[PDB]
Amino acid sequence: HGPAQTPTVFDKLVEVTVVDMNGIRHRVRGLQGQSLAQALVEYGFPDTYFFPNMGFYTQHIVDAHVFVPKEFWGKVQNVDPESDDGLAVKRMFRDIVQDYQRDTSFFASYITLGAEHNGMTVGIGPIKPWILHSEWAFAGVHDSRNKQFDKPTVEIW
Amino acid sequence: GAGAPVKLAPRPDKPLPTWYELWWDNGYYPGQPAADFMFGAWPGNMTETYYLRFWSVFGLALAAPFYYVANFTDETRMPMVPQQYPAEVRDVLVQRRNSMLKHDFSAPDFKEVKDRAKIYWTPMY
Amino acid sequence: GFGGGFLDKDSVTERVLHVTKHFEKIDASKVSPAASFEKDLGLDSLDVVELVMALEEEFGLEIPDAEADKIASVGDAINYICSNPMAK
Amino acid sequence: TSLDHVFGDNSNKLNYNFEPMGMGSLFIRTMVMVGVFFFPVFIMINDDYKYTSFLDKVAAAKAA
Amino acid sequence: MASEVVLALPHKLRVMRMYRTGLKELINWSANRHEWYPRAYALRQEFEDSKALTDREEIRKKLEHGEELLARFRHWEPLIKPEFVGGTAYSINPAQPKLKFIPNYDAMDEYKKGDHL
Amino acid sequence: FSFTDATVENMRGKHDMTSGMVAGAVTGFLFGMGRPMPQPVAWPLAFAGAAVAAD
Amino acid sequence: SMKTLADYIRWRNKEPIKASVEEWRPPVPVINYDKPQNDVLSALDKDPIVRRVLINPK
Amino acid sequence: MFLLSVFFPLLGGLVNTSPIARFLGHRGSSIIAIGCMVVAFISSVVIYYEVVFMGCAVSVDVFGTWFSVGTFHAGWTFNFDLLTANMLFTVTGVSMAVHMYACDYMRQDPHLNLFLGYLSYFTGFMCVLVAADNLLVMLVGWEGIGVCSYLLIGYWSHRLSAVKSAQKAILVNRVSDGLLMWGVLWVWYHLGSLEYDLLNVYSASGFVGLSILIGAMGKSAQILFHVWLADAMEGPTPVSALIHAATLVTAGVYLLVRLHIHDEMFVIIVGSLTAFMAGVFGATQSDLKRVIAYSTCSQLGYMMVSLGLGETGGEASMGHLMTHASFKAALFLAAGMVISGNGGNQHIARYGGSAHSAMFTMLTLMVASLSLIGWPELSGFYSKETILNLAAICADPIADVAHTLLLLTAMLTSAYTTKLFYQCFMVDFSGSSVTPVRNVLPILAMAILLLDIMLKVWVGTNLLSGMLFFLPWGVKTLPFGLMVAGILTATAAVGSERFTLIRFCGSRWGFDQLFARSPVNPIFDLGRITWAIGDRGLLSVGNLRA
Amino acid sequence: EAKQFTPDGKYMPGIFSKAKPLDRSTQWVHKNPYIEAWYYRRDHFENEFVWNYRTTIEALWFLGGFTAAAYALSVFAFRQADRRSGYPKRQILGDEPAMVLPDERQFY
């Protein structure tokens, strides 16, 4: 231990360029170890962009459909397609995305921001109408100014 | 002389074998197998085939004389009869299957006493 | 006594010089510390094997074989023995 | 490593693959072990057989 | 035949290890040291009769035969000095390593010394 | 299953659980043929177990 | 072909995969000449070298 | 005086292992141990004179009933009769000298009072074993000496080979303990009681004598059970002297002499094979303590054959036990003094001369060695010649082969014991450490056992000494010639060129190596099967993924 | 060189103190990664079961073999006990109607 640098937030900052569904580019800052869906929520994106992670014991996690370029395909975390997490991802692809799926389609909670994501450009993918319960649904149209960040709780019930 | 130097055994720094609990590592060098001679070189570089081959002759070399005397020699080889007793003393002494008085070939009930000294294992009902 | 389990340099030197002189071909006046076994003294490999076995006998040691291969001079033997805690 | 020049080093490794015994060797040695350590069972089974064959002889020669 | 360690040695050190192990095995098979001295002299004279050889095939044949002999005559009860590995006095009463002490552990954070649930 | 059951029934001369077990083994081996190998044993066991539970 | 329950059962017929990574081995002392002896009778017992250096010296 | 022979060594062990010993230290604990053995020996001397000579047995109800469920009734009761008095005199007299020796031999050990307390516990459980009147208090003594043998063999616990020797002794004896327990079940079921005086058997069901014989073969270290005895040399020298003289190995022979319910064919064959095997084993060893260990195994074979011969043979068996303990303990103590005089070396190729030992150590080794080889009109001469002459007139044809095996064994014993003396003192010096021990306590410890050797000649063990079994001069004086043949051969120091026989015998017939894979590795592999293939495999029920 | 007690008792936590306090986790072991991996693998060894040749053969001859040996020994002991007690043949599970449960009012 010596005269080495004091830790700053700028050492742990990750910048991601996000293109929303209107084509507008956005600058999104996050921290290392934070997932991508959390940084998207804290940036101030509307609540129609997000949906529950459809696994058991993880519906309190919000998730988004993102398009990831081929260079950053290998930095998405690995999911066993035979495990229960794999069936959760399969349920999300079956029910939420459907025929908006591309070869670049991932889910934003499965991306953990590190230094390798610095400068990565992603885009928000479209989703189909869905319902979890009466207090959390999506009718299909992204016409709402309510941010996801302003919701005090994520309710599974 | 307590406090003599002794070399320490290193910790594992590679992936372990599946059945690693056949080595006894007590902390000092050297460790040992869980049972000695289960693996590793035997003393004198002998093998199991060596001992089994020498024993396949040596075992019959030791079992040969007992068989010969138990099947080809009997009580009459002795130059004298066993120790003589009065009837009231003898009659309880030869009740033991263990007794050496059943080898009295001059007794009037020699055969019957020998027929009563047959070892049984399961008690009948 | 003296030393943290190790014998002193001078007595080890004296004992090694005593052991080294037990050859017919050896001139005694050439036996000194830091003298080579082959080049300076004129002993072959078998003579060196016998000398290291005699030093094992002298200091009560079981010298490991890789260490006995490295000993090639009087000073090497003295430096090895002075690094033994078990040397008596 | 401060005693490796006194008692030997860690360079020579143990030659053993930690693998199970062969199937036939295990079967044969287990059968020998069963025969040696469970010999009262075989003794009593032989007693039952020798007893029932005598009653067979009695029942055969008795009813004739 | 030699072990995988001895087979990796240079030729000079290979012959030296063979002579050294022969002398030690002659110690192990003898009744006393005074029995051992003329056997040591005879073993030395045996090695001196192959010193002036040059043909590497004859050298290899003699070396391999002697290593087979040393594998045959390995004593089942070798003589080891007691305070070394395989001796009878190795690893008896070593000095304890430094072990750490915690004073008054029961008195630190009383009423909360169980397991959580 | 029904033919193997009644055949073993008439062959053994009595009604018991053996005919159902044999018919189950035959039917399950018919189902399990051509499959990798836990299955040519596992399916006779399942059909015989169904017969045993039925009895 | 035909879809059955056998497609949905995780059968235990897959061999576990091993790796080529070198496993740990404990150190052991050196045995200089360790050829395993299986012969009760050997010509090496009556070798002339053995007779010259063990039996014959006075 | 009667309860003082049993309680009071246990009291000495309790004192020296408890936190009372924190206030005494090494110096005070040595005093406590020696005094607590002197009192017990005095009590045993009084018991011996009352019961053996004046014939008055004493029965003591000590602590009431132990447990009593149904007709299975075990009581805390002792009975002091002829065999019990013989054993108590022998055990306490040997253990007193071993304590006096150990207070000086283990002086430089860091935990000396713990060692002394373990020795006292071992002695006390042996006294409980021989003083019991029923089978269950005997089993208390049996397992107590087993546990204390484990604690004392693996005393130097930082050495792995000592720990494995102690574990091996436990496991080998556990097999025979299981068979002995099943035999106790047979005895109680078919006689109705557990007390010795109500166990009079004329004709029982075969499993009784066989299973009790197997249980005795474990403790007395007979054939296929001797493997633990040689490895028990990892413990210190007082442990070996007390194991091989008075405790542990004499317990199975005592049990068979007490019960007398054996079948003689098994007993004679096992004993004679053991005697010949241990005779050839000890002839080819170079470790000084291992030769004496194998001579112990050989003499236990002699006693086994004798108790096979009959009731007179049982008395001769007890007599040889009693005389064997004294010179065997003396041999081990003298060997310990020779080892300490030579810097801890145990190889007999590195001895020689008369500088590394006291005059009394050499005299002790000489006199105990002469008693062991059956030199005429010493202690072992009477008992060993009695067993040999009783085996020469038995009417069982099996005893014909046994007598020949015993005579060959006698020649082998006089060979290797003379070799032990010859290598130690007569040859030129070939060690390098001369630190002879001349302390008062070990010398007095040796002198006491030599006094007991003289006492056995002057006062016999039983009435058999002086009785003449009528044999020709050729049959009678042949063991003397066999002793002389062993002495002449060993002093000539001759050897044979049949090296494969030499390495087959010197490696002790490969029993340990064959046992390393005939039961042991299969037990490990069957455990692998029952865990991996059964618990994790065939019986395992998995999860339903959804 | 921490001070976790006042001179009159009174344990102090030392939350903001520089010196490292001795506590419950002071003697926790430093984990060797390979030992942790081997114990994890042995903890989940049911994932390594496979119906190969050796597994099937050893599960037949040892597990089923010794289970059948123990069933045969149990039936042998039951029948021998009933014969040595004066009973007739008795009805075990699947053995046709016969005698079960001897009467105490009867002499056998």
Ligand SMILES: CCCCCCCCCCCCCCCCCCCC(=O)O[C@H](COC(=O)CCCCCCCCCCCCCC)COP(=O)(O)OCCN
């Ligand atoms: C971790 C293992 C440690 C092992 C420890 C050593 C091995 C022990 C093995 C055996 C243990 C047995 C202990 C039993 C304790 C007492 C049981 C009896 C209870 C009781 O009330 O009985 C009365 C108590 O008497 C008495 O107790 C006698 C009265 C007091 C006079 C003697 C005082 C005792 C001195 C002992 C010295 C040290 C000896 C060490 C063992 C005797 O009368 P009862 O009702 O049974 O009537 C029948 C005869 N009257």
Ligand SMILES: CCCCCCCCCCCC(=O)SCCNC(=O)CCNC(=O)[C@H](O)C(C)(C)COP(=O)(O)O
């Ligand atoms: C129990 C008894 C077992 C018997 C043990 C085996 C006894 C057989 C001995 C006979 C076999 C041989 O000579 S093995 C053959 C040995 N001969 C050679 O290698 C040729 C010489 N070459 C050289 O390089 C050196 O002189 C060299 C001598 C190597 C080193 O000595 P230096 O560096 O000074 O020069």
